[PDB]
Symmetry: D2
Subunit: 317 residues, 4 copies
């Protein structure tokens, strides 16, 4: 097949219409403003294509066969590699001065906000808090998000069962026993400024570590919007974090890592967008907050419940 | 106007047809192969748009008005910023395995070579030495004045080259020959230290070769050199007196022409690596003379000093 | 000279001491934490080296000889190229998990804040408003000596074309803006009494209030005192002169300088942003050149800019 | 512990001595030349730290416990992330002109070649074919087991290769020969045409390449000439991981083989950039070839032997 025909370059390379030229005098830098945003749209289509395919593996039940974990992780990694290029793409509009932008702003009247349908679809399908387009926007909100599909899959994490292993029970016992042992060590210290400072550190860290086990606090924060994943999904994600080296949890740990990567890359893009808007015109959204929050619970290695010989065979291929 | 209408997203976002899907079974990774090359094409259109505008400033005589030097240099810098992003873009196809590419390769049968019309137009318009009106557009790119030719013409008019008004080439030949003569007496010291006499003979052969107009006319004919002898003198004048206000922005232009040249090479290098990655870069740089002139190791003290009248002029 | 001796690799490659290894059990990922921060320090030394050299060109009066504008602009561009690499460098600590960082954190107890002496010196020398010893002498010198913002402010106050006797840029600008706004008010009043006219009447009143605020020296002196602005009123006039007449040969390279000062400023912000994200990842716009950003976004139509007289055009030509 | 003391900044920040300043007149741009190469050295020490730790997991037998595959893959991925930054680092020396480099070149006299001990150690420890205390470190890098050798040993133990068990090589040879026989008959059907001739040539070229995989004598010959580095048994093992990458036990080893090719091509991009830098200022063999070669054997999906239910569970 011919390169140009295969890539439909008759549509792609004939979609650049300068409003300054159509409404009188052409402004050279306006072509850059068209091309950058068209190139963002081509990459948003690729990100959407990969996102929906990963969503489909979860929805249609193929995620149950752990043979499909490679395809899930490699497509999410591809999404982060694309996002890194889109953040780098801002360097191109930075080659345009605001003084030059002012010469063609008037012909477009650009609003200082996210006006991309694909970016809104992307935000909705991940799990962010007219006419034919409105149907696509409604479907993005009604259908299962990546956050929901991941939450469902996390609730089935092996090792959580109270009969077998009882990860949450052993964790609560080891943390409370470790904090009790730490309190005694602090009390036995010589009464000094450092000893009083260590009581504050201990009391603060104890309040934080034990708050993990407060299901009522989590249910309250979930209602306020400050948390997104279920209490059972939090236990499942922590199981993957703590036992990441276990073969059945190695690739799911890479998945949880890339979901946090995509989340912070989405934030860097929005940050850059806001900077660009202020550069030209002048003067919470983390879907996987729980994954970032769970990754910063500072539990000492020795307090993590150990893997039994029978349990070690359970999380092995 | 509305974002999607302004960007004509009805054409842009409805140009993705997977040949695996049209000819039977869809292969997911084929969409990435379409999008990357369409995104390269959007940027090749922008690079062409900037390149032709800079070519126009030289062709229509606006380069004579030094007020336009900022616009020329900023658009060439923009071309290098876009090229750096296109070199970075190879990281996206690197997320596709060759094993996965093999699953959709039969539906397109990709040739191991540059098949872009815009890339060939870009190469031609800079100065690098398939059917219908595309062959006519390719012939216009070969017939019209290249950036190398337009820059060569402008370089021949560089101030300070006047045979008696400064006479840059005459003073340079005299100071270099006198400096090499003074170095030959200082080189001839004790026993052969032997490495210093050999290094002098090699460096003398290279430095003095600059003044051989017959050797340059020969290399120009063989294709090993692209700029005229007068243009070489003009570019060296800008290099040596880069600090002079009139030569500050033209020095930025000569540097960015070498930057775009080496970025064009990095892109072609990456393309060849990608082709070998999926299936079973030399000194052909348009501005070879600019790289060659920038590496002539003439000591700072040997450069002719700026005349009091010439210092006000430049 | 030998590569390793020239680069003093006997010091550089023997400066990596893992506190986990020193205090008992070694933790592999701790070496990464040392190397990345030592590499940031090497580049902070280079940025300081370039910054001080550019500061010296302004202090010793060499900036007056416009022959030195290339050296000033190329070193500031080099500073932004280095800053872009430092922002990219965050990708290396992102290869370390917070869970793995936790295994060596106890041995160092890293504070969640900027603890680099060189980064503080860099911030001070540029002109950032806002525990040591001996190093407190270097910190005091950074605070007492002229900042880049001050040196640039002084140089901006000397911009050609500002003089009321010759050209009078500020006078012509105020006249053309007020006359242009008066002509725009007539076009708004000459329009019907429709919703579009009233919507345009409010947009005109707001845009007129913004444009004319540029000429309020008392408002600027107040904002300067509150910290919301950093450059003098005369320096603002000088920077706008360079912005509007950037094409003029004598103003081409100074325009590149003003552009790179805004680039370094936003790159310094991206670095601090990334630092804060890294700290939250592991543990859980006060820009120096605000005025340059603010002046670049005053939406004045091209036709309202005062024209260059034939005698004045020859003045700004080298 | 204090930031500056912990990082030993007393050594790090007092290792910059400009030879221009020591030998008379200081040249400002010389400081950049020192800092960039010192920063490359800090990263070569980190790469070596990660590389040796991964070598140790293979040497001490910990690679046998597949629980350690995550730590092996994440440290190799970290090595490629560091290498990408070192390739990006060339942008810093590109802010220095050759004319400015010439003003300090005389004081150091830099040779146009790899003069780093750490880069040589890195090259040797990966497996690149080839002072007093430093010469001992260089000899240990050549005598000790390379990453290529340690990976080759581990690849020879890949499950599924055993002729008694799954017999991957036997089923592959049978399916390829039968598939090529079926393709030959399909080609020899339409009347002798240009398209038929194009199909006969493509078939004969692809048949010669596919069947060459089963020539152990050709591989033993190429291994002796240096054109190939991995043993014949290791090639079978790597192809087993490529073809059955989706199998849970082979998912992480596939990521490892992918990153070994990434590090390899990044090492090439670094050396390429080094050579370009040397030509910019003066003017003047991939360790895992077999992994790249195996990834480009164009075998149709349906010809790959199907996973036996006994082998799939293992
Ligand atoms: Cl192509 C186009 C058409 C109409 C508005 C925009 N606005 C930009 C923001 C922006 C505004 C002024 C100066 C620089 C940038 C924009 C970019 C991306 C998105 Cl998702 N929405 C919006 C762009
Ligand atoms: Cl979109 C399309 C359609 C048909 C052929 C190509 N060939 C690629 C090269 C390439 C070949 C195989 C695997 C990876 C890459 C190509 C890329 C860029 C250019 Cl200018 N020409 C050519 C691509
Ligand atoms: Cl090498 C070293 C020694 C002691 C403290 C820090 N703190 C880091 C911040 C940071 C803290 C925890 C996890 C990740 C990062 C830091 C980095 C840069 C600067 Cl200027 N100050 C501080 C680092
Ligand atoms: Cl720090 C130092 C001291 C002495 C020689 C080199 N040579 C550089 C190459 C190079 C040569 C001239 C101009 C630009 C670059 C070099 C860089 C990296 C390595 Cl591994 N070996 C060597 C550098
Ligand atoms: C059979 C299973 N894939 C089990 C499962 C669920 N979540 C997981 C997380 C990590 C590892 C395994 C799981 C499934 O139920 O989908
Ligand atoms: C007025 C002029 N631009 C002079 C000129 C020619 N080449 C140059 C290079 C550097 C500086 C100036 C020139 C012209 O004749 O076009
Ligand atoms: C002679 C002069 N260099 C003039 C000057 C000052 N600031 C400027 C900005 C742009 C152009 C020129 C200047 C001086 O007074 O420093
Ligand atoms: C037990 C084992 N790790 C088996 C092994 C060897 N090479 C492999 C490649 C992929 C998967 C497994 C292997 C060993 O013998 O090292």
């Amino acid at each position: 097949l011919i390169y140009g025909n295969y890539l439909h370059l008759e549509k792609v390379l004939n979609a650049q219409e300068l409003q300054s030229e159509t409404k009188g005098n052409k402004i050279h830098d306006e072509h850059l403003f068209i091309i950058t945003h068209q190139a963002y749209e081509l990459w948003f289509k690729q990100i959407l294509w990969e996102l929906d395919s990963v969503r489909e593996i979860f929805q249609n039940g193929h995620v149950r066969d752990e043979r499909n974990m490679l395809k899930v992780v490699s497509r999410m990694h591809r999404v982060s590699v694309i996002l890194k290029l889109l953040v780098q793409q801002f360097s191109i509009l930075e080659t345009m001065t605001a003084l030059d932008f002012n010469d063609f702003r008037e012909y477009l009247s650009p609003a200082s906000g996210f006006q991309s349908l694909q970016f809104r679809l992307l935000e909705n399908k991940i799990g962010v808090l007219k006419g034919e387009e409105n149907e696509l926007l409604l479907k993005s909100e009604q259908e299962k998000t990546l956050l929901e599909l991941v939450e469902a899959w996390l609730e089935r994490t092996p090792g959580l069962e109270p009969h077998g292993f009882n990860f949450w029970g052993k964790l609560e016992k080891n943390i409370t026993r470790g904090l009790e042992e730490e309190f005694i060590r602090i009390q036995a210290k010589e009464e000094s400024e450092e000893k009083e400072e260590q009581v504050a550190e201990f009391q603060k860290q104890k309040e934080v570590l034990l708050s993990l086990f407060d299901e009522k606090r989590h249910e309250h924060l979930l209602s306020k919007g400050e948390r997104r994943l279920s209490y059972r999904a939090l236990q499942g994600a922590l199981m993957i974090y703590f036992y990441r080296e276990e073969p059945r949890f190695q690739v799911p740990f890479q998945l949880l890592t890339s979901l946090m990567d995509i989340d912070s890359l989405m934030t860097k893009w929005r940050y850059n967008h806001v900077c660009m808007v202020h550069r030209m015109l002048g003067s919470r959204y983390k879907v996987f907050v729980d994954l970032f929050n769970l990754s910063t619970y500072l539990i000492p290695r020795h307090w993590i419940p150990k893997m039994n010989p029978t349990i070690h065979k359970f999380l092995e291929h």
